[PDB]
Design a binder for this molecule. Structure first.
Ligand SMILES: Nc1ncnc2c1ncn2[C@@H]1O[C@H](COP(=O)(O)O)[C@@H](O)[C@H]1O
Ligand SMILES: Nc1ncnc2c1ncn2[C@@H]1O[C@H](COP(=O)(O)O)[C@@H](O)[C@H]1O
Lengths: 366, 240, 366, 237
């Protein structure tokens, strides 16, 4: 864990002095307000500083270095001016998509590396990018910005040598931006050796609380009645979208097919599914395709609690710890408790020192 | 303790509301035809009614839905398109039959919801949570009107009244939510509305107010781009 | 392990009665003679039989079902006629590439699923393909062939339900082809339930031997002399391409940079590298980009021993077992043995009961 | 017997062969300019020689390489292009100087390797040798093509090449021969059309039309023959 040493926060993109074409790109992509990182890291990068950012995924990392890079790009020069590096080609392609999107209104060619001596931005993996430099495939003399995304992952995937080489093959004055979720010995060595008086930024994941959501429960009494109460709950209150939790994959899939029989539109995620799959499921769900998402408890950590108004714990988490990851933060949480789940809900009662009032009849308003 | 408890054909007020909540809660692009047909089965109950009271309620709840969930306004609008098109022609109301009846219902339900009105400039808090929702549901409505208008389920007179209300609230230091609503409405209905029973000349006054709000008002860059784009879309590109 | 029950082997593509456009595609792609699988599985598939093939990767699986599918495609019908399924999108895209390649001379649109109701062949993952069917996105009524590639992997990645669904959503007369490296309880259940009197084919991996290669050794005496002998060896004999083995990653990378200083062109692979990376390294190497490949012992299993004439064991495998995976099968193997590596080479001597004569001066000929 | 490891500078026969093996073993498209320059430094030794013996050997070994490794024939051909273009003009041979000298060398080394000849129809002992002789023979005809394309050889040598292939193309040709002729036509066909020439291709393509409509050849080969027939007659290269 590195310490922050740069106290300059810009809250609006409007105050970043970006070019209209670029500013149009970011807006016309979804971004409306800069995230934590983007508020602190974008400006220094544009200003030419070396930036060492310790940041987790889904904080706006890709948007941070992509926006700052495009701003620095000279539309006149038709050669590689910035190199973006990633551990995998999948991650490299994603970066390229985002970069291309933000640059929809600009005249900037983005090429992937896994006819690239005329592109103004190169994205690729360490192994491939190195081989291309050695083969004199892409011009490096115009490179002024070198971005290493997820350095910890690149080093753990045996790209040390490759990366080190790249450093020595670029113009000695090349600005270095390095982002990484963790800062191990390996990564810090790169930092010390290849970076000059870096702007050190650290974005801590926001702590979760229950204070933002109103939580209730429903004594279904017996397990056989859980589904009954669920369907009846959709007769009582109006719902935009909801997320349902179960302990096992089996129940997740069983509840899923049952709901589909009653003409519900549901998405289901569990552990055995590839990250690729889950990601799509959640993306299409958060876009409005489906209106119900059933998930197992294991993936309550790497899950996103968007503006989904309602969360239902069909099952009661075997591990008390997992209650926060289910309903943590403005929303509503309704728990399904049986006669034997009473003592279980008591555990959650004392553990978080919170209160779970029984579901009133006045919910249509609430 | 006052709590919550679980549990050819006719249905009372409650049974109608409960079944409609569930059905409008299930409405997706995937399960559309299946759920919209069951909703139609509830609207067809009015064949056994004098003043078509049940059908009136179905239209009401759909509007209420479309106003609380703007993300699906276009879909709810198509649900109305189906009800109008596939309604039982034998349905009589003691106050026109078949489709022509539902069209009038839609219009009436608009006027009703619209007359409720709302304010743009909003003062956590108490009544503030209500006045903020009134605006949200108000703007949710103006959006729903657009999707109904595009499907030709509403006449121009209602669209005029809609722009009318937005313009009056567009010359009094408009909020960004209002500007957002007007842009989206113009992207949905703009071209079509260009010709309708004095219509294009209404957009002239509207776009004029925008030119002013672009060159003087203190608005975010994001909003300023949206306004500039639709200005070019109409004037230069001509909706093409 | 399933038992074979179909004894019909076709040795030449010319005897498969394929269409010229398709036959041109396979040839113009590299394939000149059908592999083990292709010799036994292609025909039955074309003939309409259900085929259950237990096959490893790199045997010609993709080519087998791709060639048979295209042959069965009706260029007239502009709708999905065959569905190809894979565990991952990466694997799905690869399948699509190959299918598109073989169909370069044909008029057949291939679409990936991770405007697809007009494509004649659909490739995708179980989760995505299912969602698209449910959303009435792609027409399934014209489907006559359903291919499940790497069934074991799909089931282990939590695609059971999805797959089962697909089966019931296709025309009941849809021909089923299932390939899988392993045949666990899970996969066999699918087999029994969804397949009709399947042509069962099993291709066993070919056993490795030393009888095909002539092996020598060179008493370098001390470790410090190993590199000396290597460079001198390139002064003595003519080499097209060679593969060098080391025990550790460190030496692999050290030897690599040393050779590059002497203007050698080398590729290096080790364990910490992502499968993606190795695959590219080996592909570009086998294409002639580099003329030397240094690899660690761990990846002597999943490595390809092509027409590379020369193999050099710079280090002597700590594990005697790994000697076969290094030089197993017409080629030449030269070992670098030090004073302390003597007893080590003795182990390999008795273990394989083979003979390793000392490197003669008459190698320029041999 | 066994194996044992070890202009200002001169080099004897062995040192020249050993250094050239290493250099020709390193020749890649990536390390081309660097290695081709070091090979040129060995060829320039002949400035201190009467009969340019070292240069002759350099040309010899390059041919030997190009014939055992057809996959790089085009690259080895460019190495020759560099030697001809960047040779020390002060080099004299007591048997023309500079480039004009290397051009003659290339031609001579062709005739030499070519006269060695080979057979098409191959019958475990001497068979391994007669099979290599054909492989290196066909490897040569390929190398000739890449030299011809770069204008490092005259038409007379290309004629002799087609001449040899045609004679062996009317005697139940092997698939390896047919393969070689197609690839040669794809490499030099168009260019050769006009040379002290097209009427020679007429007789050649005639032999092919026959071998297409009569000979028992694999479908794969039949497609290659049909394609180049259309490429010349219809598409016109
Ligand atoms: N300024 C922003 N506003 C809203 N969402 C953002 C912003 N920047 C990034 N994101 C989202 O954060 C997710 C992960 O970002 P990253 O950490 O860059 O991979 C992406 O899916 C983006 O949609
Ligand atoms: N008939 C064939 N001839 C030569 N190589 C093949 C053939 N079929 C497949 N391959 C190669 O085997 C590899 C793996 O094949 P597959 O098992 O189909 O994934 C591919 O990279 C192909 O290049």
């Amino acid at each position: 864990q590195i310490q922050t040493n740069y106290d300059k926060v810009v809250y609006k993109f409007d105050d970043m002095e970006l070019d209209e074409n670029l500013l149009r790109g970011v807006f016309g992509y979804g971004f409306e307000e800069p995230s934590a990182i983007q508020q602190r890291a974008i400006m220094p990068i544009i200003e030419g500083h070396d930036v060492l950012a310790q940041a987790q995924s889904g904080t706006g990392k890709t948007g941070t270095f992509s926006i700052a890079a495009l701003q620095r790009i000279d539309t006149s020069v038709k050669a590689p001016q910035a190199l973006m590096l990633a551990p995998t080609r999948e991650l490299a392609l994603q970066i390229q998509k985002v970069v291309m999107a933000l640059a929809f209104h600009m005249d900037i060619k983005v090429h992937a590396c896994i006819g690239l001596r005329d592109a103004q931005i190169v994205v690729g993996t360490p192994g491939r990018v190195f081989d291309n430099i050695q083969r004199r495939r892409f011009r490096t003399d115009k490179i002024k910005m070198f971005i290493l995304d997820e350095a910890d992952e690149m080093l753990s995937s045996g790209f040390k040598e490759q990366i080190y080489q790249i450093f020595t093959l670029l113009p000695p004055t090349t600005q270095v931006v390095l982002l990484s979720a963790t800062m191990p010995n390996d990564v810090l060595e790169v930092t010390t050796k290849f970076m000059r008086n870096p702007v050190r930024i650290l974005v801590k994941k926001d702590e979760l609380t229950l204070e933002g959501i109103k939580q209730f429960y429903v004594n279904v009494e017996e397990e056989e009645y859980k589904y009954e109460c669920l369907t009846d709950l959709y007769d009582s209150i109006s719902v935009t979208q909801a997320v349902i939790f179960c302990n096992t994959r089996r129940k997740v899939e069983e509840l899923t097919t049952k709901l589909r029989n009653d003409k519900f539109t549901v998405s289901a995620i569990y552990s055995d599914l590839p990250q690729q799959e889950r990601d799509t499921i959640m993306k299409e769900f958060r876009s409005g395709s489906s209106r119900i998402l059933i998930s197992t408890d294991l993936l309550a950590r790497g899950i996103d609690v968007q503006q989904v108004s309602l969360v239902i714990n069909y099952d009661l988490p075997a591990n008390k710890e997992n209650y926060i990851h289910r309903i943590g933060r403005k929303g509503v949480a309704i728990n399904f408790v049986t006669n034997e789940d009473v003592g279980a809900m008591r555990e959650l009662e004392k553990f978080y020192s919170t209160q779970i009032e029984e579901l009133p009849s006045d919910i249509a308003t609430l | 303790a006052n709590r919550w408890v679980p549990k050819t054909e006719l249905l009372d007020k409650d049974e109608v509301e409960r079944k409609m909540k569930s059905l409008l809660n299930k409405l997706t692009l995937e399960m559309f035809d299946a759920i919209s047909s069951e909703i139609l089965a509830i609207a067809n109950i009015s064949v056994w009614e004098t003043n078509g009271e049940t059908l009136k309620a179905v239209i009401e709840q759909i509007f209420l839905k479309a106003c609380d969930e703007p993300h699906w306004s276009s879909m709810y609008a198509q649900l109305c398109g189906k009800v109008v098109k596939e309604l039982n022609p034998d349905i009589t109301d003691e106050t026109k039959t078949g489709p022509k009846l539902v069209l009038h219902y839609l219009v009436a339900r608009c006027h009703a919801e619209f007359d409720k009105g709302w304010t743009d400039k909003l003062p956590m808090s108490e009544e503030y949570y209500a006045a903020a929702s009134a605006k949200r549901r108000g703007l949710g409505l103006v959006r729903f009107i657009g999707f109904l208008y595009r499907l030709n389920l509403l006449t121009g007179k209602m669209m005029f009244e809609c722009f009318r209300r937005l313009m009056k609230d567009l010359t009094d230091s408009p909020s960004e939510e209002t500007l957002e609503s007007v842009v989206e409405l113009l992207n949905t209905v703009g071209e079509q509305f260009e010709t309708d029973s004095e219509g294009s000349q209404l957009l002239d006054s509207l776009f004029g107010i925008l030119d002013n709000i672009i060159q003087t008002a203190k608005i975010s860059s994001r909003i300023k781009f949206k306004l500039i784009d639709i200005k070019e879309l109409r004037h230069d590109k001509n909706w093409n």
